[PDB]
Amino acid sequence: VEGRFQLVAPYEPQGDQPQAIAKLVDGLRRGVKHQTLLGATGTGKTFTISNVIAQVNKPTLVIAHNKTLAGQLYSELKEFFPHNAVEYFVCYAKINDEIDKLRHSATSALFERRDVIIVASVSSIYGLGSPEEYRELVVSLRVGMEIERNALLRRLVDIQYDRNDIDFRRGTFRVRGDVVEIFPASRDEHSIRVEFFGDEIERIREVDALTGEVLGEREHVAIFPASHFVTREEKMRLAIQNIEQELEERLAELRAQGKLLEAQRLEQRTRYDLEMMREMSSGIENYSRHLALRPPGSTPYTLLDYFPDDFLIIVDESHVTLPQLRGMYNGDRARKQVLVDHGFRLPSALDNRPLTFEEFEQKINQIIYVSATPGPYELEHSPGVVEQIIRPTGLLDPTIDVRPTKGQIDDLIGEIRERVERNERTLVTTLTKKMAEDLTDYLKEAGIKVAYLHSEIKTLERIEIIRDLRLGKYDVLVGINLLREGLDIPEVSLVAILDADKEGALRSERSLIQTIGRAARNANGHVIMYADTITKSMEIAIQETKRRRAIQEEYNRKHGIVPRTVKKEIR
DNA sequence: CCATCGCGCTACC
DNA sequence: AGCGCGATGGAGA
Ligand SMILES: [Cl-]
Ligand SMILES: [Cl-]
Secondary structure, three states: OOOOOOOOOOOOOOOOHHHHHHHHHHHHHOOOOEEEEEEOOOOOHHHHHHHHHHHHOOOEEEEEOOHHHHHHHHHHHHHHOOOOEEEEEOOOOHHHHHHHHHHHHHHHHHOOOOOEEEEEEOOOOOOOOOHHHHHHOOEEEEOOOEOOHHHHHHHHHHOOOEEOOOOOOOOEEEEEOOEEEEOOOOOOOEEEEEEEOOOEEEEEEEEEOOOOOEEEEOOEEEEOOOOOOOOOHHHHHHHHHHHHHHHHHHHHHHHHOOOHHHHHHHHHHHHHHHHHHHHOOOOHHHHHHHHOOOOOOOOOOOHHHHOOOOOEEEEEOHHHHHHHHHHHHHHHHHHHHHHHHOOOOOHHHHHOOOOOHHHHHHHOOEEEEEEOOOOHHHHHHOOOOEEEOOOOOOOOOOEEEEEOOOOHHHHHHHHHHHHHHOOOEEEEEOOOHHHHHHHHHHHHHOOOOEEEOOOOOOHHHHHHHHHHHHHOOOOEEEEOOOOOOOOOOOOEEEEEEEOOOOOOOOOOHHHHHHHHHHHOOOOOOEEEEEOOOOOHHHHHHHHHHHHHHHHHHHHHHHHOOOOOOOOOOOO
């Protein structure tokens, strides 16, 4: 590889992926800042993007709008680039430990090699100190280097590695006479064995700690700090002093106001935190601004800042991701402020925050937004769109009937019964938790095996219910707004949309396309809208569905593609 | 106004 | 593992 991406896949680009790839790549090479990939559900957008990443060879940040999508994209990208550094940067016993490790693998990789793709959630790009410091404080070790064992040990301690001769673990180092064995914070199962002859480095080896294999000799190795908030001792002392002076003034302020409970609470928690500013703390991010000695109101350091300046950003499901990004500042600021009011945190804790949307914009080099339904921001900043409509599988956008509200529930049930005999599944979407609840009984009353999906349901149980649906424990799934982007269930032939004309965010153009899209994974995919009116949003959804289907049907007969329902392994 | 998300605190265990 | 709190998309009083 040598710092270049190698896209590995069992197939090549198909349908209209080639032109999509070509346009985006061209756009990047001409210095176009914002671009948008208008890719229909099931056109392999991640593969399209991977080809794009592979050709331009920039360090890439992939931003998902939740952990589930981040996880999937991470595992997909790992398969696509098995010889490159695909990393995973999400927020927070051993599950916590694994996340800390993966975060460290991600940041250190940005300073080890160019061929790096990091998948992060939009909420998880924080919790970091200066990248300049992170790099500057590396312990760089070379063979031949004049250095004492005890001095190397001291330098490792200063960057937060613990001596631990008994345990064999991440973020520690072992000592046996002349051999020091370092486990980087970024590795669970790999260590660096450093061998001294007198006060000189005779040999450096990479070791597989699980298998015990010695993997090779190194002339040079780089050990990165075991925390992202490490600073030099002088800077650290001054941080401590600033924190102490701030605490004094706020404690006096709170007491002057007769908020003695709050003052007590603040003093107690802060002192406790300061206790471990000698010993090792948790929640240290709250002091980030003082630790960096930076001005009040300063933009925080983020994952974006660890990337080089010529990096690439991919925003997955951009229409949801960007508004989530936009609203985080005000949301976080308001929660933190009440914590400051009740004396849980110092006022400087407000500087431990997400970026404003404007700050995010300042940090962009080049960006590609990815959505089947791009938001207005994406369209306004991108010069038109790179459209991608033809599926390598041949599958077509579904057919749509509009049917009236009268006896709709009886109509739906009969329609569903036909699917069960065809061994096919159905998805239904109502407006409210109430109606969904009623409807799910109606169906249980009529003997239909059905499950109900709503916000109260939890990740692990959601997963279970999707799985059971695919397995055939259920034939129908009912929900409100969770039968949407991300949902990939090829056994679904029917998507029912109740109150399809009852306008709002739930029945917007954008939402209709997304919900319709759940029918685009089956060769017999069909959508029924239960409405007495054809609304404008409805009008546009149906027309766009029709337009795509027509183009795809022509394409399919020009090239002799047979729409095949993608068999997808059940996990 | 509704469904849904994610975040720290507290009342739990 | 559960509270209250403010986000969000888009029409509504
Ligand atoms: Cl010793
Ligand atoms: Cl534009």
